[PDB]
Structure formats: structure tokens, C-alpha cells
Design an enzyme around this catalytic site. Structure first.
Site, PDB file in Angstrom:
ATOM      1  N   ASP A  76     -18.950  14.513  -9.090  1.00  0.00           N
ATOM      2  CA  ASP A  76     -17.926  14.496 -10.088  1.00  0.00           C
ATOM      3  C   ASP A  76     -18.313  13.718 -11.343  1.00  0.00           C
ATOM      4  O   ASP A  76     -19.498  13.776 -11.755  1.00  0.00           O
ATOM      5  CB  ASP A  76     -16.663  13.954  -9.376  1.00  0.00           C
ATOM      6  CG  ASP A  76     -15.351  14.581  -9.792  1.00  0.00           C
ATOM      7  OD1 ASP A  76     -15.011  14.296 -11.036  1.00  0.00           O
ATOM      8  OD2 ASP A  76     -14.663  15.249  -9.025  1.00  0.00           O
ATOM      9  N   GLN A  96       0.805  -1.231   0.000  1.00  0.00           N
ATOM     10  CA  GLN A  96       0.000   0.000   0.000  1.00  0.00           C
ATOM     11  C   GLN A  96       0.849   1.298   0.000  1.00  0.00           C
ATOM     12  O   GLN A  96       1.736   1.537   0.839  1.00  0.00           O
ATOM     13  CB  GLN A  96      -0.984   0.044   1.170  1.00  0.00           C
ATOM     14  CG  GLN A  96      -1.752   1.370   1.278  1.00  0.00           C
ATOM     15  CD  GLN A  96      -2.897   1.183   2.270  1.00  0.00           C
ATOM     16  OE1 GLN A  96      -2.680   1.423   3.466  1.00  0.00           O
ATOM     17  NE2 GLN A  96      -4.042   0.667   1.823  1.00  0.00           N
ATOM     18  N   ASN A 113      -8.091  26.375 -11.511  1.00  0.00           N
ATOM     19  CA  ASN A 113      -6.738  26.101 -11.937  1.00  0.00           C
ATOM     20  C   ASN A 113      -6.361  27.256 -12.841  1.00  0.00           C
ATOM     21  O   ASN A 113      -5.771  27.139 -13.902  1.00  0.00           O
ATOM     22  CB  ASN A 113      -6.673  24.634 -12.555  1.00  0.00           C
ATOM     23  CG  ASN A 113      -7.263  23.480 -11.639  1.00  0.00           C
ATOM     24  OD1 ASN A 113      -6.960  23.404 -10.436  1.00  0.00           O
ATOM     25  ND2 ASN A 113      -8.180  22.638 -12.047  1.00  0.00           N
ATOM     26  N   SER A 133      -8.508  20.366  -8.080  1.00  0.00           N
ATOM     27  CA  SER A 133      -9.427  19.238  -7.980  1.00  0.00           C
ATOM     28  C   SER A 133      -8.903  18.175  -7.014  1.00  0.00           C
ATOM     29  O   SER A 133      -9.655  17.446  -6.378  1.00  0.00           O
ATOM     30  CB  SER A 133      -9.598  18.519  -9.295  1.00  0.00           C
ATOM     31  OG  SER A 133     -10.608  19.113 -10.090  1.00  0.00           O
ATOM     32  N   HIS A 178     -11.418  11.268 -13.614  1.00  0.00           N
ATOM     33  CA  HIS A 178     -11.347  12.367 -12.636  1.00  0.00           C
ATOM     34  C   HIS A 178     -12.048  11.996 -11.313  1.00  0.00           C
ATOM     35  O   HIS A 178     -11.490  12.131 -10.205  1.00  0.00           O
ATOM     36  CB  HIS A 178     -11.925  13.626 -13.298  1.00  0.00           C
ATOM     37  CG  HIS A 178     -11.751  14.902 -12.523  1.00  0.00           C
ATOM     38  ND1 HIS A 178     -12.713  15.360 -11.619  1.00  0.00           N
ATOM     39  CD2 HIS A 178     -10.756  15.834 -12.550  1.00  0.00           C
ATOM     40  CE1 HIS A 178     -12.303  16.498 -11.081  1.00  0.00           C
ATOM     41  NE2 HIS A 178     -11.135  16.818 -11.648  1.00  0.00           N
ATOM     42  N   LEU A 206      -9.287   2.649   0.496  1.00  0.00           N
ATOM     43  CA  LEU A 206      -9.348   1.750   1.641  1.00  0.00           C
ATOM     44  C   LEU A 206      -7.987   1.524   2.242  1.00  0.00           C
ATOM     45  O   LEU A 206      -6.969   1.483   1.506  1.00  0.00           O
ATOM     46  CB  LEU A 206      -9.918   0.385   1.181  1.00  0.00           C
ATOM     47  CG  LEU A 206     -11.316   0.580   0.595  1.00  0.00           C
ATOM     48  CD1 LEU A 206     -11.802  -0.706  -0.058  1.00  0.00           C
ATOM     49  CD2 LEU A 206     -12.306   1.031   1.677  1.00  0.00           C
TER      50      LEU A 206
HETATM   51 CA   LIG Z   1      -5.463   0.762  -0.153  1.00  0.00          CA
END
Ligand SMILES: [Ca+2]
Ligand SMILES: [Ca+2]
Ligand code: NA
Length: 274
Positions: free
Chosen positions: A32, A2, A154, A220, A63, A74
Site C-alpha cells: 500500500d 479500545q 470502487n 480497500s 490509506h 493491537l
Molecule cells: Ca488497540
């Protein structure tokens, strides 16, 4: 296995998570381009789509999936790690495949969110103009107790010109600009009187369609870090009002320079959630 994107520790989300506060029971809506629900690093609980022809749980642009990853990928042994990995995540599709949307589509998503009881709404999107219905939507969400966060824009700077877009510009909405991994302001982040806080927005790695991970730049990218922080604070102090949550974030931010380019500074969730 991870990866921990630099933004997480940069805003001290990790310290809070180490306290045992991960956003559990907090519902966040990502307004979004939809979210690739099948991504293994994400758990989408529900949503709606206000865009013709596309369901809320696919993302043909990427996006939306990236932004959701920053809020809530997670905490496991793969992919990335969200700011608030235990939140209940809703994908509300208001932007099409090409990344653009109509005012009334946006307005419907904000109302849906309000109505469906979300605690925080993220809008990584913005236009040169607002609209009355849009202003009404946000003022009512906030007055109803939802924390509303939007990307500042932006657009960069020019002379003394406000380049802050809508809905970030409304005052019931937190306008977030972008810093890089050195905490410096990124060249593309809009400027203006309304700018409120900064968060990581350059070189941000997150979830990306199909079942992968990518780096993107943008206000964003900064916005979900703030939406996620709000969620952490709530998980820790469920008693607070939206305006209280808001005020914690700006008051404890780390100062970086003039508020016209930096708002009150870079958020510090650990100090914010004290
Ligand atoms: Ca993860
Ligand atoms: Ca999944
Ligand atoms: Na604002």
C-alpha cells in the site's frame, strides 16, 4: 478505551479470537502507501519501499495505515482492534503519497513478499488494466502458497458490465467487494463475474496517521478484513494450503444475493475456521 469497529463482530472475527486464535506467527504483507510505523496501535515488523524517495515505514497518505489497522491493530486498551491482532505485519510501500503506483513498483512488492515468505498478501489497490508481469507475480505467489487478496474496485455497477479491477480480476487473487454495517452491498462496490466475497467496506474506523483513528469507505477497507480472516484461519490450522484457505472463506460465506454483485456472500470467519 479500545473501540471495536463493527466489521470485527460482523465477520465473527471476535468469536475466533475468543478461541485463542489471533494470527500469531502469521506474516502479512500490506502492499500500500506505507504504514505510519510509530502509531501506538500498530506493530510493524519489517518491509520495503519500491517508491522513490519514501521509506517503507512512513505513510504520507493514510490509506496504508488504515488498511493495516483493519488487519492488525493491537489488542490492548486503546484505539481499535484488528481482525488478527497478533500477526507479524510487514509494510511494503508500492503506492505513493497520492495513492498511486506503477505496475513495476507493484510487481516488485509482490515478488518481495513472495521471496520473503509472507503467508498472506493484501492489495487494497486496483487498476483498469493488468499486465503480464503482474499476472505472473500473483500466479506464482499463490502457486507458492501465499493467500492473495485484493480490493474489487470502487466502480459501482452499470447494466451488465464487469467493473472488477486488476489484480483482483486474476484468478489466483480473491476479489473482495464491500457491505455496510447492515450487511448490505455498498453502492460503490464493483461488480462482475470475478467478484468472490464481501466484507465490511463502508464506515470503517481504523488507525490513521498521526497517531489517530478515522473512518473511510471503500473496497480497500473490505480487503484487509479478508486478509485478516485468512490469517486467523492459518493460526488455527497451520496445515492448510492457500487454496484450502481460500475455499473455506468462499464456501462458508453468508449468501446475500446474486454472485455478480455479491460473490458467494459475506465472509464468516468462525464458520470458515472450523
Ligand atoms: Ca488497540
Ligand atoms: Ca508503533
Ligand atoms: Na480474482
Amino acid at each position: 478505551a479500545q473501540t471495536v469497529p463493527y466489521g470485527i463482530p460482523l465477520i465473527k472475527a471476535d468469536k475466533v479470537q475468543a478461541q485463542g486464535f489471533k494470527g500469531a506467527n502469521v506474516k502479512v504483507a500490506v502492499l500500500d502507501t506505507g504504514i505510519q510505523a510509530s502509531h501506538p496501535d500498530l506493530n510493524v515488523v519489517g518491509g520495503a519501499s519500491f517508491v522513490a524517495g519514501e521509506a517503507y515505514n512512513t505513510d504520507g497518505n493514510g490509506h496504508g495505515t488504515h488498511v493495516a489497522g483493519t488487519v492488525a491493530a493491537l489488542d490492548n486498551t486503546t484505539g481499535v482492534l484488528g481482525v488478527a491482532p497478533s500477526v507479524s505485519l510487514y509494510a511494503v510501500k508500492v503506492l505513493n503519497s497520492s495513492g498511486s503506483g506503477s505496475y513495476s513498483g507493484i510487481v516488485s512488492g509482490i515478488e518481495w513478499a513472495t521471496t520473503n515468505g509472507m503467508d498472506v498478501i493484501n492489495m487494497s489497490l486496483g487498476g483498469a488494466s493488468g499486465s503480464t508481469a503482474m499476472k505472473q507475480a500473483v500466479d506464482n505467489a499463490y502457486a507458492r502458497g501465499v493467500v492473495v487478496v485484493a480490493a474489487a474496485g470502487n466502480s459501482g455497477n452499470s447494466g451488465s458490465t464487469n467493473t472488477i479491477g486488476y489484480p483482483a480480476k486474476y484468478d489466483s487473487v480473491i476479489a473482495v467487494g464491500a457491505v455496510d454495517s447492515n450487511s448490505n452491498r455498498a453502492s460503490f462496490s464493483s461488480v462482475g463475474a470475478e467478484l468472490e466475497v464481501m466484507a465490511p467496506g463502508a464506515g470503517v474506523y481504523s488507525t490513521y496517521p498521526t497517531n489517530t483513528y478515522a473512518t473511510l469507505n471503500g473496497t480497500s477497507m473490505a480487503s484487509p478484513h479478508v486478509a485478516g480472516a485468512a490469517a486467523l484461519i492459518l493460526s488455527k490450522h497451520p496445515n492448510l494450503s492457500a487454496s484450502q484457505v481460500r475455499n473455506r472463506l468462499s464456501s462458508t460465506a453468508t449468501y446475500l444475493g446474486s454472485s455478480f454483485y455479491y460473490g458467494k456472500g459475506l465472509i464468516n470467519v468462525e464458520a470458515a475456521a472450523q
